[PDB]
Amino acid sequence: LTLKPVEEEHIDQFNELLSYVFQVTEADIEESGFENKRAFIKSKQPILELSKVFGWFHENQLISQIAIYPCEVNIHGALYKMGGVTGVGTYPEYANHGLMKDLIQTALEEMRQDKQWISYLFPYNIPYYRRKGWEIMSDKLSFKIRDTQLPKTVPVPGMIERLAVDHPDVFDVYARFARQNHGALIRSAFNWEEYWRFENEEERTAAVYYGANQEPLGVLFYWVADEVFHIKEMFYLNQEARNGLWNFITAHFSMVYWVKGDIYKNEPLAFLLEDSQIKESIEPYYMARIVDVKAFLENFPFESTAKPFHFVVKDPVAEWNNGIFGLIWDENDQVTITDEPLGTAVHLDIQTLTCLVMNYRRPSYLHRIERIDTDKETLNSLERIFPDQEAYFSDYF
């Protein structure tokens, strides 16, 4: 067996393996406008030619593979290069042999050289990927509210236009949304095609809310079908915009029995309605992994300063993430990341640290459930320095 990069030549093979593992629903293949799922996976190929791709070869057959798609994301206000793992798969035959372990090893080595200090991953197998060091970074919420539970109109100064989903104003609002919302993908025109690849864009519309200035501040992607108002999602730069969009939705009362939508961050709708007695479902949506602890931390926008302490980190795959990471802020509250166990220890594994930095859970909770080992004082330090915002992420790959 040979583990090597996969090339131009091998791309056909890459695709074939990918159909055999791709867990796309039959419903989503129909909605996408692609006849079958081979046509569907052949549209993913422009992603692959951007990515670093590796595989195992039963020479010269491709039997297992991993790709790293280069992205950029918002981590608490800082733009980080991100390694997006896609196209992962082993042929069911070859699953006992720790093939994927080495691909992941390889991929992490590549991500580190590419200065990708954080990696996102859609979870095909949470338990497997958690053992390789990933942790959940974000939730997706789903709700279904009765027409009878729709919110009362809030006075707003602006107006709504119904626009094509690829109107330039949509892109502009998202470019700013991503820059002020933790977790988010910074999108190119190309990430936007991928955003719409399971759906017929022409059967969707963007309700865009314009402030009194005719500047767009909010986007609702929706369609009406069989007396349901369908919300793909909404994103808004402020409360006025949110309220404008909800005003537009509640004006559809006489057209619909229900309103169904998703929210791509753990921020339940229920509280924000006057009738909060709805059921929402909450599911983990994406995972993340710190690739290089030191380099991650030294770019991290810590909220505040602290007495010096240090992380003692265990990483089950990446050698360079084991050991001591000391933090010290100087007079100008500027941080440096040391190798010195200066101050009290905080013992955790790579999963838990990634959870911390993505704020999927807070330090205290993780201490409480015995995933962080340190003392009360340092635990207060963590709570002070780690920002408290819920990750947003809308993309798929």
Q: Which of 219, 245, 233 is nearest to 164 (CA)?
A: 219
* Residue 272 interacting with a copy of itself (CB under 8 A): yes
Among 70, 284, 308, 341, binds a copy of itself (CB under 8 A): 284
281 part of the interface to a copy of itself, by CB under 8 A = yes
Q: How far is the CB of 204 from a copy of itself (least distance, A)?
A: 24
285 phi/psi in degrees, rounded to 5: -105, -50
Whether the Cβ atoms of residue 320 and residue 351 lie closer than 8 Å to each other: no
- DSSP letters along 326-350, please? EEEE-TT--EEEESS--SEEEEEEH
Look at the chain and count its residues: 397
Q: Binding of a copy of itself at residue 316 (CB under 8 A)?
A: no
- Of 55 and 211, which has the nearer Cβ to a copy of itself? 211
For the bound state, the minimum distance from the C-beta of residue 231 to a copy of itself, rounded and expressed in Å, comes to 18
Choice from 209, 229, 360, 392 touching a copy of itself (CB under 8 A): 360
Residue 283 within binding range of a copy of itself, rule CB under 8 A: yes
Q: Is 362 in the site for a copy of itself (CB under 8 A)?
A: yes
Shortest Cβ distance from residue 3 to a copy of itself (Å)?
A: 28
Options 25, 277, 332, 334; binder of a copy of itself; rule CB under 8 A = 277
Cβ atoms 248, 154 nearer than 8 A: no
- Write down the least CB distance from residue 154 to a copy of itself, Å: 11
Nearest to residue 302, comparing CAs of 86, 145, 19, 75? 75
Tell me whether strands 228-236 and 258-263 are parallel, antiparallel or unpaired.
parallel
Q: Is the four-CA dihedral 67, 86, 350, 294 of positive or negative sign?
A: positive
Q: What is the total count of residues that contact a copy of itself (CB under 8 A)?
A: 31
In the chain, helix, strand, coil percent, each to 5? 35, 30, 35
What residues from 241 to 270 belong to the interface with a copy of itself (CB under 8 A)? 268, 270
Q: Does 144 bind a copy of itself (CB under 8 A)?
A: no
Instruction: Name the residues that contact a copy of itself, by CB under 8 A.
Output: 123, 126-127, 130, 136, 142, 239, 268, 270-272, 274-284, 360-362, 364, 368-370, 383, 388
